[PDB]
Ligand binder design. Structure first.
Ligand SMILES: NCC(=O)NS(=O)(=O)OC[C@H]1O[C@@H](n2cnc3c(N)ncnc32)[C@H](O)[C@@H]1O
Length: 441
């Protein structure tokens, strides 16, 4: 089968052969978008093009974009290690039409790449599609132009409980380009639990969301109002790791060549032997987001972007502790990561030494309190009555030991214990009040 690198290249080659300008992945950190924490989609760097404020010499483009979804509008941090399909860091394969072609040709390009004997040659019978309920045009295209049996065409409305809140209406954020979208799913088969989209078991890993095709139509305002974009446009987005799993005949993202090799490296540096333990998958994911974020300029801190990075690093170190790592390990994974990322890791390779040092320092810094904090947490959980850790304890771990509340929640979740978030926040607010009283005017 094709390697992840070969699949990445083949996608770009396909769209390049179809007249699309190949554009390099943007950084994970925008310089000119105050609404955006980290790059969460291939379309981010073309935001102003969709808005009609930025003109390019090309009207169609294709990219393999590095993304991090660990905060802001799209945040999958808490899914990592619990599903076979969610990462913090991942690559999004995209083609874009800037007032060029529209619905029919977008769908045709995607179907051709996925199912043509000349290309990916996926079995058509295992592919399902969803459309926005009101998008009769998209329904007709799939039914009559492509020829998907009606039983595998699913209409999805505002299923997230609010106007435009839907799996079939894609938004960059609370503001920005958005529109109805159509998605392509692949059935991994009855050896995996789950039902098709729209079904009660839709959240299972059986029917995997592979490719989202967004018909960009509006710019969302802060008030929630939709203002039409000057030209209806196309934003498509396919998870590289997810399509790689399909093409390499495996079911989990973590079973692709890239992750198999990376997980081996994690086992090596932690001294773990059970290659199936979920902590290995968590660490493998976390080194990708952490290393690339640092390569793109993020430094660990207690504020904004730096704190998200700090939180992920510390959670990774914690998982390493659970596996029995006896020495500083996380930075040792940068090399192995560079080795599996191919051309997509060039910015990381360029800054290998710097990234390694940042991660080493951060782990060493956290090690000053990690085991001591875990000891306290164990002590508190041992005598805890009920299914919820009190906010005061969570706050003490935060204030004394440098445990972000989500790191504490992560440890507790593994023992079916919740954290009183309201209590933690009350404790933080109480401390802020003390600070104001002491500092004065
Ligand atoms: N602009 C349009 C758009 O963004 N659309 S989409 O939001 O739906 O993400 C595009 C695709 O990236 C994959 N994907 C999304 N999130 C993750 C994740 N956390 N981990 C792994 N793969 C993911 C998945 O294949 C998804 O269909």
């Amino acid at each position: 089968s094709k390697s992840t690198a070969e699949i990445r290249q083949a996608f770009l080659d396909f769209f390049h052969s179809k007249g699309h300008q190949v554009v390099a992945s943007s950084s994970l950190v925008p310089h000119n978008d105050p609404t955006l924490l980290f790059t969460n989609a291939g379309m981010n760097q073309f935001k102003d093009v969709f808005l009609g404020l930025d003109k390019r010499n090309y009207s169609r483009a294709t990219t393999s974009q590095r993304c991090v979804r660990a905060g802001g509008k799209h945040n999958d941090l808490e899914n990592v290690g619990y599903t076979a399909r969610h990462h913090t860091f991942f690559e999004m394969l995209g083609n874009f039409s800037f007032g060029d072609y529209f619905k029919l040709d977008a769908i045709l390009f995607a179907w051709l790449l996925l199912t043509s004997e000349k290309w990916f040659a996926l079995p058509k019978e295992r592919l399902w599609v969803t459309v926005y309920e009101s998008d009769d045009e998209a329904y007709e295209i799939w039914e009559k132009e492509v020829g998907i049996p009606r039983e595998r065409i699913i209409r999805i409305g505002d299923n997230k409980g609010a106007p435009y809140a839907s799996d079939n209406f894609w938004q960059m954020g609370d503001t920005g380009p958005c529109g109805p979208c159509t998605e392509i799913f692949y059935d991994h088969g009855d050896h995996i639990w789950g039902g098709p989209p729209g079904s009660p078991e839709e959240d299972g890993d059986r029917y995997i969301e592979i490719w989202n095709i967004v018909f960009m139509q509006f710019n969302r305002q802060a008030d929630g109002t939709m203002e039409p974009l000057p030209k209806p446009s196309v934003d498509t987005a396919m998870g590289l790791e997810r399509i790689a799993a399909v093409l390499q005949h495996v079911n989990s993202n973590y079973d692709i060549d890239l992750f198999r090799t990376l997980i081996q490296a994690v086992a090596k540096v932690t001294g773990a032997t059970d290659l199936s333990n979920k902590s290995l998958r968590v660490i493998a994911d976390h080194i990708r987001s952490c290393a690339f974020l640092i390569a793109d300029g993020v430094m660990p801190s207690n504020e904004n972007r730096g704190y998200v990075l700090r939180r992920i690093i510390r959670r990774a170190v914690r998982h390493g502790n659970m596996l029995g790592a006896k020495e500083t390990f996380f930075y040792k994974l940068v090399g192995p990561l560079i080795d599996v990322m191919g051309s997509a890791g060039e910015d990381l390779k360029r800054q290998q030494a710097q990234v390694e040092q940042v991660l080493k320092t951060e782990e060493e810094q956290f090690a000053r309190t990690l085991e001591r904090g875990l000891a306290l947490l164990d002590e508190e959980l041992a005598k805890l009555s009920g299914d919820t850790l009190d906010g005061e304890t969570a706050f003490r771990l935060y204030d004394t030991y440098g445990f972000p509340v989500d790191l504490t929640a992560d440890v507790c979740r593994e023992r079916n214990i919740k954290v009183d978030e309201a209590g933690f926040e009350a404790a933080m607010e109480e401390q802020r009040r003390r600070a104001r009283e002491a500092s004065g005017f």
